[PDB]
Symmetry: D2
Subunit: 203 residues, 4 copies
């Protein structure tokens, strides 16, 4: 169930960290520091290789929010593979969701393969429910899902990923590729958005 | 202009580096070490911000091969922006070229991030499409640029390495979808060249 | 700024959530400060340091042994600032043990911005002593960066100029902090189990 | 393994292609070994060390000051291996050499241990041949030397782990110094003539 961040977690003062100046007024607190995300991701990579390392893996990135987690998770997986006795090749693909998948290879590349789906965040779990359905029709050897964040919410349809970075409360977070109206993707920490930031970048 | 790698560059013995096990007999030499790419990319990030830091930047990744260079270049740019501030907001988008609405590019500093440029036709093609939507500025960063008389003449704005006319893999560059899961840029061996075809 | 405040009742992190050196699996209780969190805090400290000390040649003094990890990473962040900024300053380094053992002649400190880098402040007596010696070599300025500062009644009231984390009165190991020379080979700051405390007991 | 062989006619890289401290901008001639390349080689050396020296307790011995960076990074890669694999324990010590051994714990700590000596550079090999000659009479289980650099020169010894074999050029950076300067530099570089004059003692 990953690293549990409780509802009462204050987070960290912005001034205790290096923060891009253009977002200085737009953030309330640092919620999950970049380095903590790395540490957690290093362990997740090992759990992935343990469960899925026996056969060729197709890593599927869910753009856009998933791009940072995906890149770093794969870098840790690569670090394992070039310092071990045994490994399996990995292929990568990228998709965007619209219950319609856009971009990416013909999903026949997934049959017979060990498919790892990489998301930034699970909320109600409906987005993942639909995607898994589309994927399992192509009869892959195995489908697992890694999500950096899983929200505790009375709206979850019951779905839970196989790999979870952090279990967080239902707050709106940004950073580490997670966005608010396309903003805050260029931020290494996961942070909570300020009220003024929310008004300034509102559409 | 970038780091010039000559035609006679021997590259490195694989045994001198950490190489993923499943590619051990599929590679011949390490051509550009992962860390050398990182060092070059750090300098490129600074060059990008000197040129494009005056206004909102849309970073445009050309999938799939550009994804690694893209992620690392942006990491270095972000390091600059949080440690010398003095900074500019940046948005990102991703596109694949098959041989978001491009109105989002209007009035912005667009940086196209590419893995490799050979003839330069792909980039010229992409640029002609982008410029229809009137960005304030378009620049292209390419990790690799091949030395070849087959070049149509197009020169990108930011170049990591100028390399000879060799087929290279690694750092997200593929051979029939293989070798993307490799941190070094390397040259493929004959054994590997006939196993993944 | 007292740095990042870790309260008395911070439970820390379950070991199974992180990559832990296998030979220390039973020897640790909880992860207290993850390595990455140390890195992020250290990055800001590096900027804080240059802001105050970047006007003149800096001599960075590492207090061995426990200070070596924090020292290496802090300097790495400082160097990152120095090669990506319009202007910068030369930095020289030296290493001392406190019993002052080793190190160059302290006349090398004369006229320089001296940065003392420590792993942990407890009572503050070690630093007060060192500071009162260093001043007699007339540095341009002298500052102390400590990764950790303990909340203790035992404090003589010395506070360093740069602090990573303010922690409760617990014994911690990792990130070069040792328990009888063990646990220096650990990237996280952690709390030692009863099993490991007896197993590595002198 | 003689390590990564850098040939005598190695031109190095233009400084302008890399991020370099402005205070050294006129003091360096060329970048010789980029920091990232050092990392890549060190990663592999870490696996080589652990294959040969694991598993018994390893005492890692850093030869200050030049060795401190290579020491810190080599040990970081070793620790990455120790926390992402099956089975692996190290203690560290730091020594300085007087032209004797200064600082350090009493070398009785080395007895019955796997001792890894970590150095920045080997020239004549005298410094280390003399050091090994001392360490051994404390009867360690084994003693190995990892050196970042070995120069091609008249040499009265061969280390067990080598990062790079370099020509007979004076190099600085990555903790390697010229009269205490250039330690605050991530790349290994060749010193310019103005840099020699400027920081001359
Ligand atoms: N940055 C950020 N985004 C959040 C957050 N929560 C949700 Br839902 N989202 C949005 C996720 N949604 C993105 C659609 P759009 O906003 O039009 O680009 C869908 C992602 O998939 C998970 C949602 P679900 O499990 O189906 O309820 C959050 O806390 N932070
Ligand atoms: N990995 C690798 N690929 C190379 C290389 N050279 C070319 Br051309 N390519 C092919 C680039 N192409 C790969 C398409 P796909 O078959 O789906 O993977 C993409 C376009 O690149 C731009 C070449 P151009 O400047 O227009 O001549 C190379 O050295 N290494
Ligand atoms: N690993 C660890 N060590 C701690 C801790 N607290 C102290 Br005090 N120490 C010991 C610090 N001391 C160990 C030296 P020695 O035992 O003689 O080799 C060094 C000096 O630290 C400064 C304490 P002070 O501020 O003068 O009260 C701790 O929480 N963790
Ligand atoms: N930075 C740098 N230094 C070099 C170099 N070559 C030598 Br010799 N040295 C000098 C190393 N020596 C002088 C240090 P100090 O007493 O502080 O002046 C230190 C030990 O290195 C071993 C040399 P050796 O193998 O015994 O000939 C070099 O290429 N670069
Ligand atoms: Mg999502
Ligand atoms: Mg969104
Ligand atoms: Mg391309
Ligand atoms: Mg101490
Ligand atoms: Mg101690
Ligand atoms: Mg030496």
């Amino acid at each position: 169930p990953g690293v549990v961040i409780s509802d009462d977690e204050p987070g960290y003062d912005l001034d205790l960290f290096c923060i891009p100046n253009h977002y200085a007024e737009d953030l309330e607190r640092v919620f999950i520091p970049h380095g903590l995300i790395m540490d957690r991701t290093e362990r997740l990579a090992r759990d992935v290789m343990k469960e899925m390392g026996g056969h060729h893996i197709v890593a599927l990135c869910v753009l856009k929010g998933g791009y940072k987690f995906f890149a770093d998770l794969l870098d840790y997986i690569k670090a394992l593979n070039r310092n071990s006795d045994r490994s399996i090749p990995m292929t990568v693909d990228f998709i965007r969701l619209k219950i319609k998948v856009i971009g990416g290879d013909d999903l026949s590349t997934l049959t017979g393969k060990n498919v790892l789906i990489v998301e930034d965040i699970i909320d109600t779990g409906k987005t993942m429910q639909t995607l898994l359905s589309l994927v399992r029709q192509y009869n892959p050897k195995m489908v697992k899902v890694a999500s950096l964040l899983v929200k505790r919410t009375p709206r979850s349809v019951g779905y839970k990923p196989d790999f979870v970075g952090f279990e967080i409360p239902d707050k709106f977070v940004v950073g580490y590729a997670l966005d608010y109206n396309e903003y805050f993707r260029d931020l290494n920490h996961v942070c909570v958005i300020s009220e003024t930031g929310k008004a300034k970048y509102k559409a």
